[PDB]
Amino acid sequence: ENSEKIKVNKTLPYLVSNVIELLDVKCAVIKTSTRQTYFLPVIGLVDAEKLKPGDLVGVNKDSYLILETLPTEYDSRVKAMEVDERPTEQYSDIGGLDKQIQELVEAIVLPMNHKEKFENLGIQPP
């Protein structure tokens, strides 16, 4: 069977579609990325509970059928705003702003490393 099972997946090109309604009359209704809706009677090679309405799922190009659950997608613009090369500017580089640098490190950095402290006093971090 595995040889035949891979044969359908061996057609690597999938058609990304978003699950619209996981009807239980354990079926699924999908909306391929071509503005076409469908009523896959059998979910396919994926669990009937791992699929929640709105998830991204790949579909066989010719016989539409769910084969995998792709990871959630984010706009290309939003991914380019995550810094990977950390800037090199120590706190000693900033001058004069001593009463303000501390006030920030204790509201955006400290509450991120000493969660045991706020929960001990029961104050939601700012």
- Piece of 30-38, 69-77, 79-87 that binds another protein (CB under 8 A): 30-38
**CA 71 → CA 86, 90, 112, distances in Å?**
26, 36, 27
Task: Tell me the closest approach of the beta carbon of residue 43 to another protein, in angstroms.
Answer: 8
Contact partners, residue 26, CB within 8 Å, separation at least 6: 43, 48
Q: Cβ 1 to another protein, closest distance in Å?
A: 5
Q: Is 125 in the site for another protein (CB under 8 A)?
A: yes
68 binds another protein (CB under 8 A): no
What does the alpha-carbon distance between residue 91 and residue 94 come to, in Å, rounded to a whole number? 6
Looking at this protein, which amino acid is placed at residue 109? V
Residue from 36, 48, 50, 105 in contact with another protein (CB under 8 A) = 36
Q: Is 11 in the site for another protein (CB under 8 A)?
A: no
Strand ranges in the chain using DSSP code E only, listed in sequence order: 17-21, 29-32, 36-38, 56-59, 66-68
- Binding of residue 43 to another protein (CB under 8 A): yes
From first CA to last CA, the distance across the chain in angstroms is 57
The footprint of another protein (CB under 8 A) covers 1-2, 4-5, 8, 18-21, 23, 25, 29-30, 34-45, 53-54, 63-65, 95-97, 100, 103-104, 106-108, 111-112, 117-118, 120-126
